């Protein structure tokens, strides 16, 4: 059984027991969170879809780890015009394990 959900604007496909990186959701590192933003629950033979968000669908997802990802070197630059910026960034992420898709 796999499910489709939108969280933080961006939508993600997920299966049962899959670890997917999401955005920095300000919740404890060892806590179970529920998702009602589910668009599709796919059983295998009988898929379930309704309106923008499904009526009776809840995703039980365990928070695994908070942290900052890969560092990016934001180089802004202009040729011949004496200018050079360099900013760095690591995007804050929350890794989620999905314990089960509940209907």
């Amino acid at each position: 059984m796999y499910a489709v959900f939108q969280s933080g604007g961006k939508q993600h496909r997920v299966s049962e027991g899959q670890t997917v990186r999401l955005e920095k959701l300000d919740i404890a590192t060892g806590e179970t969170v529920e998702f009602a933003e589910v668009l599709m629950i796919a059983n295998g033979e009988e898929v379930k879809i309704g309106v923008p968000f499904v009526d009776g669908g809840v995703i039980k997802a365990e928070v695994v780890a908070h942290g900052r990802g890969e560092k990016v070197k934001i180089v802004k630059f202009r040729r011949r015009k004496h200018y050079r910026k360099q900013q760095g960034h690591r995007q804050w992420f929350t890794d989620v394990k999905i314990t089960g898709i509940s209907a």
Partner: protein, 117 residues
């Protein structure tokens, strides 16, 4: 006091050179060239951070079109149908569905058709 501008300079060079790894010819050795190359890469990275999203969208849309046409519908019309339905499934997800579980895609197509009619 006089400061010998050596060790720090070396360090400065070092990071640039390490950034310039996998660069043909002078780019992975000669500093003048190397720094330039690194800068250009950075520029491109910046651009592509903002450009790559569009490429992926183009890909996903194309995939959807391929799938839609196989099922027997034009892409724009399909999208309109989806909008009418109010289901907020994005391009990426649709593409993924098309790639793997086709029954779901078929169902989606049917729904879109219903919305249209």
């Amino acid at each position: 006091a006089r400061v010998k501008r050596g060790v720090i300079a070396r360090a400065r060079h070092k990071k640039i050179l390490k950034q310039a790894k996998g660069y043909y010819g002078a780019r992975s050795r000669v500093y003048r060239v190397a720094f330039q190359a690194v800068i250009k890469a950075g520029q491109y990275a910046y651009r592509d951070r903002r450009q790559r999203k569009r490429q992926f969208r183009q890909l996903w849309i194309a995939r959807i079109n391929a799938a839609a046409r196989q099922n027997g519908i034009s892409y724009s019309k399909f999208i309109n149908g989806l909008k009418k339905a109010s289901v907020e499934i994005d391009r990426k997800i649709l593409a993924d569905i098309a790639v793997f579980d086709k029954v779901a895609f078929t169902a989606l197509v049917e729904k879109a058709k219903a919305a249209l009619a």
